[PDB]
Amino acid sequence: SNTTVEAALQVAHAISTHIARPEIDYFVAADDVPGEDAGAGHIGESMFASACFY
Amino acid sequence: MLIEIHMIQNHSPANLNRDDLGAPKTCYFGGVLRSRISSQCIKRSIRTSNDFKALLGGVRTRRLADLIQQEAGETECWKKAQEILNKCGFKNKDDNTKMLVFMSKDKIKDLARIVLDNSLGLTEAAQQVANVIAQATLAPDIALCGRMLEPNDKDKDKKVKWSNTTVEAALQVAHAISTHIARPEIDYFVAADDVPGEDAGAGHIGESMFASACFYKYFSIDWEQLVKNLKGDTNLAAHTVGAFLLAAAKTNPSGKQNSFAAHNYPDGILVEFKNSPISYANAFVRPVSVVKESDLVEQSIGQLSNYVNDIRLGYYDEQSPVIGFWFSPNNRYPLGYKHSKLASRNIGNLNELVGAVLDYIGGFKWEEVQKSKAYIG
Amino acid sequence: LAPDIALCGRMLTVEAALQVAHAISTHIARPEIDYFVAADDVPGEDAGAGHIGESMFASACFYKYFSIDWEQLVKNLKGDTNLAAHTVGAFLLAAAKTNPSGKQNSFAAHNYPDGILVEFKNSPISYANAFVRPVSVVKESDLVEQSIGQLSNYVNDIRLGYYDEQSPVIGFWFSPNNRYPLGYKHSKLASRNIGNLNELVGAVLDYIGGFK
Amino acid sequence: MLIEIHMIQNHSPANLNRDDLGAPKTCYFGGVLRSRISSQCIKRSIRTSNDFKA
Amino acid sequence: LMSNDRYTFADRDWYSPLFSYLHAEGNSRQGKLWLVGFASDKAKSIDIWDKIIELEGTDTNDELLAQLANRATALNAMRKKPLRGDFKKSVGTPQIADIIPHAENRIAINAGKMTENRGYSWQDADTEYGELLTKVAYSLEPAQTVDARLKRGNFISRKPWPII
Amino acid sequence: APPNTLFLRLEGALQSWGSNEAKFALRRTADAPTKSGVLGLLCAAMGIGRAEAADSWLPKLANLRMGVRIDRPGIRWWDFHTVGAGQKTRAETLLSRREYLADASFLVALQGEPELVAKLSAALAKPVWAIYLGRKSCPPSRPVCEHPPGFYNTLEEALSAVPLQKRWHNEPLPQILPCVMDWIPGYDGEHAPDDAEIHYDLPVSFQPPRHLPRFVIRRELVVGEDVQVSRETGTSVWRPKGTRADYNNSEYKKVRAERLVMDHAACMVCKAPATTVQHVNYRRAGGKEIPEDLRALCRLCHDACTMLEYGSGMTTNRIDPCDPIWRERILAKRKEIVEFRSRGQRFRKM
Amino acid sequence: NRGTVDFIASLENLKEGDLGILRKLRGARLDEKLPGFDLFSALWWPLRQKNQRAPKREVAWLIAKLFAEFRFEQREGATLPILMGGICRKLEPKKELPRVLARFDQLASLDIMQMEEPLSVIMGILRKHQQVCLDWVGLTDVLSFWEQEPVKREWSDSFIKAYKI
């Protein structure tokens, strides 16, 4: 039978009120037990941003 | 006499018209890629709205027998109604479906009273419904879009006579094109299981496509054709013109609107009365590019004003001039860069704009032409 | 003695004067397709049977060429030179402000010429060889300006190669409000660059015999 | 005397001439395909026009 | 004159009668062949044409000759295929139908070799469409992106398919 | 030496030379100009009507030997042409198809009597009537009277004294140039050869059109040994000038000093000792600018002006400091520079 | 070119302090912060006043910021389409490859102002796959002459040649 219900709520995407400024965070995990500190690596990339949304 | 409407609009990230692949509709103009809203989308979304409700005197369907059956309150004659329709000329395409028929909602009572009559045969019934279908061209929406109904004849037994079923259109809507280059984008979605315990993992990235654009829209209404289409009703024509302008100003195609909600409004409406139609789409052969400080809409309106001034100074004839009004919301966007003004008026309210348009067209009032009410249902 | 018979030709000896040629674009043709759906006003919500169709459209910058025989038109009117001048002016207005009627109720391409050049010469020619390289658009230009620039370059080359021989050529380049000049310097590539259709018709009429 | 008229005209997305199938009319020149409006279509628009009737 | 369903106008129907005439006591050379073709529907006459063919070759296998006398259906099947795939009742690519009568006139130059496979073949004739399908594909996929290049590469490879 | 042959160049965007196989609706070009085709072009050049040409002008003109050399052999394009009957009387529409030769070039050589050739060449420089290529909807793209006559020899020699013109740099060329020539008598080969085809292009009359058969032979030519490839003239691809300004050539270095003396060593807006010059109109640069295009400024004000036009999208008309509308923004940028600049960084970088 | 080579050499001549100065300014214009304007002017203006065909201000600013955040050694024959083709021919062709292809193809519809962030995304993909080289000069020239057709044709052709090895 009819399994279609018209939605009664309209939600728009939230866009910022200014030019976006993405930023990159360079995390590095640390070994609790001491080891060999010769190029531990694990330079990561965490993208984030702060904005005033409408 | 022609009434032309040129509008500049800017839309939020959305998807108002898509092709078979789901991507937004695009086109090529000036050697670059634009964004497009098809003209049949604009016409349908205008004629099916809360602002055009009183003038929706037409209908477009293949299930005319279902309309006949729902017009009565008995077991009806549903099978022989389809047999009569097959006898008419609306033959099944590859033994499937029907042919689109545009007809007024008023004259279905004649169809009900003729098909149900038992004092006749199938051939005479088919001829009579053909005659009453060919004379169902009195509606505000059928007077603008126009009609062309022609049977394939594969089922014309030289027994059903047909007549002039074509109605010359009065409204020519252009395809809306973006004033800048087109930048489509892909939204990525994942449907999440409501149960917290999944005990599984697999990538199920979906694909949705959207775009944001500043659209230039162009309309054209033939006043003398509308009088002939409506048999000589000036009041009904004026009401249709005013309601069409008010609907086109404050409506949007109901595409993917439950998920994007992009009900934006135009930032400029220019209405001009002319003798020959002119389009200003050549203003945007050079695409609009944003600069350090600019609205996209302000730059687009400036380019439009530059080209409008160039055309007015270039194609000028004292035998038939052009007078036009420019409307912006509370004069937010003046026509130009506060220089080289052209418009004979500067309206700041939409209702005043429609009133001025009607006043120039026939001296009518908007509160006066609302008395000409068509079929509502 | 009607203008519609003498100039255009027979309704359906009587040799005409017009030489309307095929209008050929100045760039690569880009045909596009549209997937329309014949929607139903009655909802129904059953028996879909998909109504997907296809309709093709295109957008282009056309170069159009016309010719008029003055002696043939005069012989067709048997001496009414004022009527011949009036018919030439009427055609100059009409061919500039008339578009084909094919599918204009759904696309409404009521555009206007971005430049008209009227020339007088002994031998006939068409500047179709100017756009042997398709026009490619760059950052600080649009398609119309580049097409007009290629036309200017070809006119410059022709007037450098085919000129003099006791036969100077005369140009009457026109553009709406002079927004598209035909080249820069080089004696303006023609005679006066004017910015009104009525002024163009008047200039041609006063050149032919000093008519009205 | 031979008056010659040359015009450059950019058009909106449209379909002004058609084949027997429905596509816009084309031609070949310079090594590519070019959109074409036929000669007899242009002569029919200039003739039988309200400008040419007034 | 009109291109409709199950027929794409290609002109010069020389390949049509080169099976029945070469099947009933006619499989000789006798110099060069000459075909006179008059085409009409019911009462209205449509066209008259003729074709000469150098026919000093040997005998031919019946299967390849029967495939040769099906070029009209092969070209209609070529034209009816749409651009990206829609089916229903589409006219396919009408821009292909514009280049068919030129490619068929180039094939007809070597019509004597084509019939008896004495230096020509259907796969040899398939290379004539390559010079023009690239020019069609540059117009059908005008974008300078990367997926457009792959679309052009897939569109270039269209060749007629021999069926009986 | 009196001229012997005459040269005609036939080249346009579209052209069509019809043949006898066009009988009911389908109209076909053959491959090349025919004798009857070019001897209607010559007849329309000297203004001879359809009547009065059959009895007098056609028999003398048909007494010629002509040959056609083909370059850019052309791509046949078909056109769906409808003729509307009505708009006998009916609303019917007649359909037909017409063939055209797209992107083609033909060189025709006609050889005969000297004074007839001279009269024909004199007529072609200013034709009486309109000249087209087969059908009236096909005008030439190159002038027909483009090559001079001369006292040449038989048609193979006459079809070798014309260069093969090109149009752009990477224009592909054919190694072989096929040519079509009329057959030649001489009573040694009095009978027609085996490799001779028959064409129906010998005109007799035009108003009740009458054509007669003519034997046609075919030959070939190779570029580099008989015809030398020429080169195009002029410029095809058009680009805007857009001269990027240079600060090293002598002319600008003298114009800048002349401007720096025109303004008495003072910055324009802040009135300080000027050390640099800023342009206003950029459409003269490269070493051709005038002193009125340049304005003297100091370091602070020119840095402010550079900041104020970084991403403003100004192509030719840049910032004019003498304009009293740009004063406030220049002053605000100058205040920002005074407040936030560090002399140490600039001193360290140089 | 020579202005581009000198510009790249000057950019690689920088130390950690000036690289941090440029790194703090990603996503910003040139006429906003005085230290960035001073550093870029002192790095670029002598080259512009010497060589007539030096890169434009916007292109040079964009390359300066991209070098600040995504420091790669300059090498010849390591253009962006070649490395994108080398990376792209290692994933499954059903889901991930169309996504990366769409990301690479977005660049053809963008002008030079709105191109720092997609290029940053592409270079982040490059950095995630252990890349330590790039051709900065060729990218600078391609960005300088971008709205033309042959440059985009060569871009896509190089991508196809790297992808179909």
Ligand SMILES: [Zn+2]
């Ligand atoms: Zn100062």
